[PDB]
Design a protein around this motif. Sequence first.
Motif, PDB file in Angstrom:
ATOM      1  N   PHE A  65       0.841  -1.185   0.000  1.00  0.00           N
ATOM      2  CA  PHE A  65       0.000   0.000   0.000  1.00  0.00           C
ATOM      3  C   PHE A  65       0.886   1.248   0.000  1.00  0.00           C
ATOM      4  CE2 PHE A  65      -2.480   3.302   2.369  1.00  0.00           C
ATOM      5  CZ  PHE A  65      -3.639   3.349   1.566  1.00  0.00           C
ATOM      6  N   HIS A  85       2.361   2.066  -3.238  1.00  0.00           N
ATOM      7  CA  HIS A  85       1.326   2.650  -4.073  1.00  0.00           C
ATOM      8  C   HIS A  85       1.264   4.158  -3.821  1.00  0.00           C
ATOM      9  CE1 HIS A  85      -3.129   2.701  -5.584  1.00  0.00           C
ATOM     10  NE2 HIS A  85      -2.234   3.070  -6.545  1.00  0.00           N
ATOM     11  N   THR A 144      -2.385  -4.449  -2.034  1.00  0.00           N
ATOM     12  CA  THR A 144      -2.552  -3.021  -1.822  1.00  0.00           C
ATOM     13  C   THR A 144      -3.962  -2.749  -1.295  1.00  0.00           C
ATOM     14  OG1 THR A 144      -0.845  -2.506  -3.325  1.00  0.00           O
ATOM     15  CG2 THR A 144      -2.372  -0.775  -3.004  1.00  0.00           C
ATOM     16  N   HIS A 145      -4.953  -3.500  -1.811  1.00  0.00           N
ATOM     17  CA  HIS A 145      -6.336  -3.339  -1.394  1.00  0.00           C
ATOM     18  C   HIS A 145      -6.458  -3.675   0.093  1.00  0.00           C
ATOM     19  CE1 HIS A 145      -8.764  -2.922  -5.342  1.00  0.00           C
ATOM     20  NE2 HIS A 145      -7.462  -2.584  -5.567  1.00  0.00           N
ATOM     21  N   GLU A 202      -1.660  -6.145  -6.368  1.00  0.00           N
ATOM     22  CA  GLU A 202      -2.855  -5.335  -6.529  1.00  0.00           C
ATOM     23  C   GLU A 202      -3.821  -5.626  -5.379  1.00  0.00           C
ATOM     24  OE1 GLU A 202      -4.659  -5.037 -10.299  1.00  0.00           O
ATOM     25  OE2 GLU A 202      -2.739  -5.376 -11.412  1.00  0.00           O
ATOM     26  N   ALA A 203      -4.091  -6.920  -5.131  1.00  0.00           N
ATOM     27  CA  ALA A 203      -4.992  -7.329  -4.068  1.00  0.00           C
ATOM     28  C   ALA A 203      -4.366  -6.986  -2.715  1.00  0.00           C
ATOM     29  CB  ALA A 203      -5.159  -8.850  -4.091  1.00  0.00           C
ATOM     30  N   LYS A 215      -5.140  -0.971   2.207  1.00  0.00           N
ATOM     31  CA  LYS A 215      -6.069   0.145   2.274  1.00  0.00           C
ATOM     32  C   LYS A 215      -7.008  -0.050   3.467  1.00  0.00           C
ATOM     33  CE  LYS A 215      -8.751   2.752   2.876  1.00  0.00           C
ATOM     34  NZ  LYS A 215      -9.715   3.834   2.619  1.00  0.00           N
ATOM     35  N   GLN A 216      -7.536  -1.277   3.623  1.00  0.00           N
ATOM     36  CA  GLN A 216      -8.441  -1.592   4.715  1.00  0.00           C
ATOM     37  C   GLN A 216      -7.667  -1.571   6.035  1.00  0.00           C
ATOM     38  OE1 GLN A 216     -11.040  -1.667   1.776  1.00  0.00           O
ATOM     39  NE2 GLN A 216      -9.473  -3.284   1.750  1.00  0.00           N
TER      40      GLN A 216
END
Lengths: 73, 73
Positions: free
Chosen positions: A14, A17, A58-59, A55-56, A62-63
């Motif tokens: 993350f 990113h 980084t998601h 990608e997943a 985020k959470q």
Amino acid sequence: MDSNTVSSFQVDCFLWHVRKQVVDQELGDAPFLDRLRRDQKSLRGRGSTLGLNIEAATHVGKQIVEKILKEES
Amino acid sequence: MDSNTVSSFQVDCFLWHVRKQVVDQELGDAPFLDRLRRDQKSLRGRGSTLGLNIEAATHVGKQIVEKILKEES
């Protein structure tokens, strides 16, 4: 395999990113960008070793951030 | 003194904060923490050199992130 390593990875993901976003904002000095590059190579090594989607990842991060922010805006 | 350096610093500051939160969550592996430490020492050097408040830098960063997030949730 320690889970803490997976979490720490998701965080670095993350972060990488947000960093890429800082550079895309045309606010890179030289050391931050260089670190971002070396970080990408390392991220690719871990991404391949762990074989986990960045990608997943980084998601999830985020959470993870929203969870830490929920404890203290 | 380029401003981009100041912005990049503010970012690293906010990042260091989020990181410290990740470690406080008891999810530190060993390399992330070590980097956080070496990052703190470097942050102190820049904090002294630049003479900028880390807390204030972290704040501006929060807005810098919300600004980048506003462009793309």
